[PDB]
Design a binder for this molecule. Structure first.
Ligand SMILES: *[C@@H]1O[C@H](CO)[C@@H](O)[C@H](O)[C@H]1NC(C)=O
Ligand SMILES: *[C@@H]1O[C@H](CO)[C@@H](O)[C@H](O)[C@H]1NC(C)=O
Ligand SMILES: *[C@@H]1O[C@H](CO)[C@@H](O)[C@H](O)[C@H]1NC(C)=O
Length: 740
């Protein structure tokens, strides 16, 4: 009856999960000849042996990452006997990353993917990887840098990898290499050697690598000025690139040259790169270059271009004007221009991008833009996303609802300096479907005159501002508005009524008023025929309902409401009246993180369509009022993180549709079949983790949990005992509780 892979857990997909279990050896675990995938991430296995994997002879995939880290954390050296991995003749994937080994173990020729990253291997020679002729992917990053230091550098002897006749992917970052290793296999398709000390590159460093698809050589000549992490200052003032370096790479699709101290672009570098789809030139000194270079003239296939964090070569500079060669980038889909810095976004700034047929995404964060003629973005062919967040725009020139993914025309103006919204700032932006103005300082009585041009806007995020919301005409100029986020609206400083506008928003489906400053003149009714989701989290619904009749019907006029979030409202009680006067259409109610101690369960009949009820984080001390009533449609009940010590028999019994019950993080000493009846065997999840279960020998609860074992999350090791003393904090399977 016990889970077959105790103390580990079956993730049905053949994956035996033994991650994070403090194990010091490979578990031996009802046969194991059918397990093909084993994960042992972040245990404490420091020694591997000849017979450790004999019972796992059919493993295909094996992850031993982080068992014995170098330093690392807060010293460790892993020993590995000769035949250890030879036991697994069909092993295809092995991860030995983050382990203190100095030499690569002997390995079965069936291997295809191998990781040796973050180890202490400093030398790769021919003996290192015999005879891995089926190997396709090899990673060995980070064996010699600040987080994992070596004295010297890692050394890849010439031709050492030629025995890997099938190698397609090779990564050797952060290894202090001073040159690209010699005589690499011609089969290579991906080569990453970023963040070493390769200050010079030529056609001599990429010899016969004619099948290269992606090449990453960035971070080899760094400017360490203002670097978040320890950096090694390049000798030269720029990476040395011979102009014919990349010429023979006719299949190059991705090239990365970031953080290379480049000061000039040369058309030569790209002359052979004609399949080039992705190019990263970020963190260089190409400000001036991109204002005038001819380099982009033939980059006709380029889809993605990163120009972010490019600095100025000379203090004397002209206002940003992208080069005319940019007009040739007809395949361009995404352009990243974060962190370049320019005060001014005008009709010439991005002019040469305007006619590009496929340009959908424009990153413009962190540029300190304080003058923006946003109307230019109404003249582009195919824009879907423009990100102007984190700038200094303050007006016209002279979790989140913003999803919105991929499909809608979206602009992000969050984290700017907007104090007042003027309609003129939106001229020519009438196709916009999603807009964010969150985290500005908008202090304004909104009244239907702010957003006139936005006739198509569907999603509006105005969270974290300072809006007056008493005007019933608010947002009346947005006829297609479906989702509106006004969470975290404050009022640091007596007419109309707060939220009166809701009933006039004919298309509104989703509304957030969460965490709002709410004063005495709130509308006593929210009214709508269209709202299906209301988030009223973090307000004072407790004090409001304490007023008596006044707000007794606050949510009732929301006809058709399906989901209501009243979490964090400092509710201590919930009269039947308050429940009966929520809209009868309600399917989901969240009362998470309140102070409810008692809840008459039979009163759920006042909510006939309820399917999901969240009472987590309150202080129900027992499930005992109390029973789920005939004939509730409740499918899921979360009563986790309360202080439930007991449940009345038959509590869940009448809940014919019940599928999920979370009972975790309570103070239960047992879990009892009598609480449920036959309902227990239709449950899809039964969560009983973090309860002080009493692990006595006679303990009835084991039988129940084993019966529904497939349905209890973390059953194998994650369900612990509170008692007795020797089993405190230990798995309920640490001993055999069935023996009595
Ligand atoms: C990398 O090599 C350089 C050579 O100048 C040396 O300063 C450093 O010891 C190496 N880095 C580390 C700490 O691994
Ligand atoms: C692109 O190719 C043309 C010939 O097809 C060549 O004349 C031109 O100079 C190239 N562009 C640049 C600036 O390298
Ligand atoms: C049960 O509730 C707890 C809250 O602490 C959560 O961590 C856990 O993921 C929940 N289980 C399910 C099935 O969501």
């Amino acid at each position: 009856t016990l889970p077959a892979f105790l103390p580990c857990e079956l993730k049905p997909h053949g994956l035996v999960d033994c991650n994070w279990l403090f194990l010091k050896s490979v578990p031996r675990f009802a046969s194991c000849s059918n397990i093909t995938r084993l994960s042992l991430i972040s245990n404490r296995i420091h020694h591997l042996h000849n017979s450790d994997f004999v019972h796992l002879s059919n493993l295909r995939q094996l992850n031993l990452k982080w068992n014995c880290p170098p330093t690392g954390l807060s010293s460790c050296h892993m020993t590995i006997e000769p035949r250890t991995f030879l036991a697994m003749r069909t092993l295809e994937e092995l991860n030995l990353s983050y382990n203190g080994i100095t030499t690569v173990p002997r390995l079965p020729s069936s291997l295809v993917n191998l990781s040796l990253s973050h180890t202490n291997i400093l030398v790769l020679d021919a003996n290192s990887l015999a005879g891995l002729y089926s190997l396709r992917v090899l990673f060995m990053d980070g064996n010699c840098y600040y987080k994992n230091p070596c004295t010297g550098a890692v050394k890849v002897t010439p031709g050492a990898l030629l025995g890997l006749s099938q190698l397609t992917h090779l990564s050797l970052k952060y290894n202090n290499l001073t040159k690209v290793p010699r005589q690499l296999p011609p089969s290579l398709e991906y080569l990453l050697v970023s963040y070493n000390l390769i200050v010079k590159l030529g056609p001599e460093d990429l010899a016969q690598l004619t099948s290269l698809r992606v090449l990453d050589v960035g971070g080899n000549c760094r400017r360490c000025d203002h670097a978040p992490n320890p950096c090694i200052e390049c000798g030269q003032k720029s990476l040395h690139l011979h102009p014919e370096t990349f010429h023979h790479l006719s299949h190059l699709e991705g090239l990365v040259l970031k953080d290379s101290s480049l000061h000039t672009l040369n058309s030569s570098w790209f002359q052979g790169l004609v399949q080039l789809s992705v190019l990263d030139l970020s963190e260089n000194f190409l400000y001036e270059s991109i204002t005038h270079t001819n380099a982009f003239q033939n980059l006709t296939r380029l889809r993605k271009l990163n120009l972010s964090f490019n600095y100025r070569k000379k203090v004397s500079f002209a206002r940003l004007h992208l080069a005319s060669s940019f007009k040739n980038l007809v395949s361009l889909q995404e352009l990243n221009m974060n962190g370049i810095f320019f005060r001014l976004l005008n009709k010439y700034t991005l002019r040469w991008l305007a006619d590009l047929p496929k340009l959908h995404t424009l990153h413009l964060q962190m540029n300190f833009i304080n003058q923006a003629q946003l109307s230019i973005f109404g003249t582009f062919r195919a824009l879907r996303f423009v990100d102007l967040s984190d700038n200094r725009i303050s007006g016209p020139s002279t979790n989140f609802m913003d999803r919105c993914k991929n499909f809608k025309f979206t602009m992000d103006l969050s984290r700017n300096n907007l104090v007042t919204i003027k309609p003129e700032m939106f001229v020519q932006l009438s196709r916009l479907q999603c807009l964010s103005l969150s985290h500005n300082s908008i202090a304004q009585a909104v009244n239907g005159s702010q957003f006139l041009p936005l006739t198509n806007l569907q999603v509006l995020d105005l969270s974290h501002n300072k809006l007056d919301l008493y005007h019933w005409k608010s947002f009346s100029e947005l006829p297609q508005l479906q989702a509106l986020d006004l969470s975290y609206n404050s009022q640091p400083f007596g007419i109309g009524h707060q939220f009166s506008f809701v009933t006039h928003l004919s298309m509104l489906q989703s509304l957030s008023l969460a965490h709002n400053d709410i004063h005495t003149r709130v509308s006593s009714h929210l009214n709508s025929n269209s709202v299906r989701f209301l988030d009223f989290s973090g307000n004072g619904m407790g004090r409001m309902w304490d007023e008596g009749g006044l707000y007794l019907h606050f949510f009732q006029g929301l006809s058709g409401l399906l989901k209501l979030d009243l979490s964090q409202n400092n509710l201590h009680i919930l009269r039947p009246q308050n429940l009966d006067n929520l809209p009868k259409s309600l399917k989901l109610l969240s009362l998470r993180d309140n102070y409810l101690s008692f809840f008459n369960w039979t009163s759920l009949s006042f909510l006939p369509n309820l399917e999901v009820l969240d009472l987590a984080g309150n202080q129900l001390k027992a499930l005992t009022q109390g029973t789920l009533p005939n004939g509730t449609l409740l499918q899921k009940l979360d009563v986790s993180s309360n202080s439930i010590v007991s449940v009345v028999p038959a509590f869940f019994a009448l809940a014919v549709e019940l599928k999920e019950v979370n009972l975790s993080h309570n103070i239960l000493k047992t879990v009892d079949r009598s609480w449920f009846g036959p309902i227990v065997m239709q449950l899809t999840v039964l969560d009983v983790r973090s309860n002080p279960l009493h692990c006595a020998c006679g303990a009835a609860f084991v039988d129940l949990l084993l019966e529904v074992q497939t349905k209890v999350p973390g059953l194998a090791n994650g369900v612990k005992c509170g008692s007795p003393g020797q089993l405190q904090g230990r798995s309920i399977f640490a001993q055999d509780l069935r023996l009595c």
